[PDB]
């Protein structure tokens, strides 16, 4: 009965493709032939945060747009003050192989993970002074890639065992598991309402999960290689995926199909991180060729370059008020731009 | 100054920067290695003879006021290229090859040759030297006395003795690198051998000295 079900699946995917073709009447480029180009957006380095000793792999901003977190293989998770370039905490880790970090929306907790298959949670506002480990979550069978905080009580992680999970920090138990991917999962971004999220895997596909029922809702497939970074549009109806084939694309949730791709024949190195701006008019993407790029998200033309790093940029993120953008590369440095 | 204390915060920053520097200095006297190979190639044997559970498994040992960290990563059953970029900047790579590769799993020796070729020409390991261990040298003698070597390499032309065949195998493995910035060290090791930590020590010292000479510009 395998052949019959295979034919049924082929018919289903043919119906999907026919519906996608029918639902498209024009392109976002055609409708945006009249808007005013943003011109050359020149940004300058404001601060340089130099405390680390090895390559930086992850970084997350604070909710108040002032405090910052960074992780690296020197075994440290040190959080910064952006305005004064001060160091306010330095958290030593148990495993030096760290590839993700998070900073709680309330500001009390941080998270960390890596090749040790464990997501650790730290308490910053303890009564006795120094920061301590609160929970040590261990349910995955592969390296973690990205973890985001729903709130102070529940967290969501994505691992390289083709699964994603939602945890209850108080009990420490894997409340829900999400399955359906084929290769390693490498990215994750939460909605503004934190009611659903997406994830991009190494099989060149991105899925639209729902945190309540734990069932995938939509599948987007346009890329040709592994996807390394996802980020929602500020209005929560689109996301941009940066893949390893030196291109990034914008997908729309309702239209269920690709809208526009951002590519240039002079670019051959792959993407490592993607983030938007406060209004969605700009797309910032890290690159393997030692620098960053700014894309006019509505016109698909380059609008600036953020040079100053002499190695791969691995993390990138704008503040919650849109005032600044921070990048961090493998040269153990981290910059702030306005 | 115009600081409103607002100045013990700066003092705290200086103290934890001092702690970071002290931690960094004390973490530069330990050598980081990386053990690679295949099953039944004896890569567990070298760990066993060196003195003193998913994720990264280590073999934490020391020798002669130089500290070592041997990372065995054979247990990560996932995509290799997605976490080998974080394993660069290691001092050396230990590769274990079994000399009794005279059977299918193709011939095991050919798989070892292909994997060595893949690992010595990766973009992250173009400048990292490799120390090569040829394991199971006692079995090889009787294996070659019983069976010829032409089963593995058809184009072999020479004596069927231990020395010439061993030299041919070693040359075949050493002819896989093209970068002039790295060197391959080799050693014939039996199943039970007296010293294998000295061979890592006196090779890591040479690697460090060569790196220092290149960095200074005196090379």
């Amino acid at each position: 009965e395998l052949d019959q079900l295979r034919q049924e699946a082929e018919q289903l995917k043919n119906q999907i493709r026919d519906a996608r073709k029918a639902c498209a009447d024009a392109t976002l480029s055609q409708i945006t032939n009249n808007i005013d180009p943003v011109g050359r957006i020149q940004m300058r380095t404001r601060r340089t945060l130099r405390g680390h000793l090895a390559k930086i792999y992850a970084m997350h901003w604070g909710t108040d747009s002032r405090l910052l977190v960074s992780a690296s293989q020197d075994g440290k998770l040190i959080i910064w003050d952006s305005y004064t370039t001060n160091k306010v905490h330095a958290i030593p880790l148990r495993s030096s192989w760290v590839m993700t970090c998070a900073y709680a929306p309330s500001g009390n907790y941080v998270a960390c993970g890596g090749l040790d298959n464990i997501c650790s949670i730290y308490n910053l506002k303890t009564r006795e002074g120094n920061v301590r480990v609160s929970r040590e979550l261990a349910g995955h069978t592969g390296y973690l890639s990205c973890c985001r905080f729903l709130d102070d009580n529940q967290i969501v992680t994505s691992s390289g065992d083709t699964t994603c999970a939602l945890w209850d920090i108080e009990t420490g138990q894997q409340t829900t598991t999400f399955t359906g991917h084929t290769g390693d999962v490498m990215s994750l971004s939460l909605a503004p309402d934190t009611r659903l999220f997406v994830s991009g895997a190494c099989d060149a596909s991105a899925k639209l999960w729902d945190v309540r029922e734990g069932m995938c809702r939509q599948t987007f497939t346009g890329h040709e290689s592994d996807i390394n970074a996802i980020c929602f549009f500020p209005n929560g109806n689109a996301f941009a995926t940066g893949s390893d084939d030196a291109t990034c694309r914008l997908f729309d949730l309702r239209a269920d199909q690709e809208l526009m791709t951002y590519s240039h024949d002079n670019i051959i190195c792959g993407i490592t991180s993607v983030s938007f701006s406060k209004s969605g008019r700009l797309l910032l993407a890290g690159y393997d060729d030692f620098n960053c790029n700014v894309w006019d998200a509505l016109k698909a033309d380059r609008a600036g370059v953020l040079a100053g790093h002499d190695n791969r940029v691995s993390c990138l993120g704008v503040t919650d008020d849109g005032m600044a953008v921070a990048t961090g590369s493998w040269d153990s440095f981290l910059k702030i731009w306005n | 100054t115009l600081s409103a204390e607002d100045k013990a915060a700066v003092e705290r920053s200086k103290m934890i920067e001092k702690n970071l520097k002290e931690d960094g200095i004390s973490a530069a006297k330990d050598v980081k290695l990386l053990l690679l190979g295949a099953g039944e190639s004896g890569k567990s044997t070298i760990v066993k003879q060196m003195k003193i559970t998913t994720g990264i498994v280590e073999t934490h040992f020391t020798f002669k006021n130089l500290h070592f960290r041997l990372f065995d990563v054979g247990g990560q059953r996932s995509e290799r290229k997605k976490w080998i970029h974080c394993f660069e900047d290691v001092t050396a790579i230990i590769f274990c090859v079994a000399l009794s590769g005279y059977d299918q799993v193709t011939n095991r020796m050919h798989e070892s040759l292909m994997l060595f070729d893949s690992i010595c020409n990766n973009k992250f390991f173009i400048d990292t030297s490799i120390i090569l261990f040829l394991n199971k040298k006692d079995l090889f003698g009787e294996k070659i006395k019983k069976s010829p070597l032409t089963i593995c390499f058809p184009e072999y032309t020479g004596p069927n003795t231990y020395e010439d065949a061993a030299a041919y195998i070693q040359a075949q493995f050493e002819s896989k690198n093209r970068s002039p910035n790295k060197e391959i060290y080799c050693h014939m090791t039996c199943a039970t051998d007296t010293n294998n930590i000295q061979v890592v020590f006196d090779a890591v010292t040479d690697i460090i000295i060569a790196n220092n000479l290149r960095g200074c510009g005196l090379y």
Partner: single-chain antibody, 236 residues
């Protein structure tokens, strides 16, 4: 869990010396800043000394400089005060406070319990005045307490360094609101503070029988730290 207990007070003849100790247990002593605060038998609180984490910076009051010495031994997590050539005006009760400092921290959060000390007979400071002295209150009513200064406390950073303390009778002071409207940890939501520059107020809603005592205001803009006379609340 967290405990500050002192010892070393008693009867001292004028011209002698004494050594006060502050032994802490329950927190990371080595990464905190510690103060010494004394209180006269009937007057208010007065600041004495200060030593920072790592013993980097040490400050002294104007009336004890050259006679008192403050030092800490954090491997054995105890704090000391060496006193020399006591006078009849040094008789008071000495307290021990911890003042961790970083971005967003809450200084002066925990206070010690104090040791008595009795001795027999033998300009640029920021003065802060609390015009109110004592007012009667009844449960279920809202009252306001005001504390005014002489220099503006609004630094260019946007911070305003005003601290409010509560001292119930036969007890050590607690921290209510710090710098200048933040609510401390463990203090109810009834208390609230407001002000600007040199005029400040503390708002209490739905007063009960448990929050009766004397309220004090302190400044942390620049050393030496200056307290106030305090306002006493009593049942009508």
């Amino acid at each position: 869990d967290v405990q500050l207990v002192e010892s070393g007070g008693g009867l001292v003849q004028p011209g002698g010396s004494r050594k006060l100790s502050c032994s802490a247990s329950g927190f990371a002593f080595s990464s905190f800043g510690m103060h010494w605060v004394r209180q006269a038998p009937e007057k208010g609180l007065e600041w004495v000394a200060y030593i920072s984490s790592g013993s980097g910076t040490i400050y002294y009051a104007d009336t004890v400089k050259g006679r008192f010495t403050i030092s800490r031994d954090d491997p054995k997590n105890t704090l000391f005060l060496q006193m020399t050539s006591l006078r009849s005006e040094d008789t008071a009760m000495y307290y021990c406070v911890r003042s961790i400092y970083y971005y967003g921290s809450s200084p002066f959060d925990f206070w010690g319990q104090g040791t008595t000390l009795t001795v027999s007979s033998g300009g640029s400071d920021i003065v802060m005045t609390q015009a109110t002295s004592s007012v009667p209150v009844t449960p279920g009513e809202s009252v306001s307490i005001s504390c005014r200064s002489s220099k503006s406390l609004l630094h260019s950073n946007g911070n305003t360094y005003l601290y409010w303390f509560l001292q119930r009778p036969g007890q050590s002071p607690q921290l209510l609101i710090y710098r200048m409207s933040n609510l401390a940890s463990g203090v109810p939501d009834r208390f609230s503070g407001s002000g600007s520059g040199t005029a400040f107020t503390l708002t209490i809603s739905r007063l009960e029988a448990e929050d009766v005592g004397v309220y004090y205001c302190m400044q942390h803009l620049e050393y030496p730290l200056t307290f106030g006379a305090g306002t006493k609340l009593e049942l009508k």
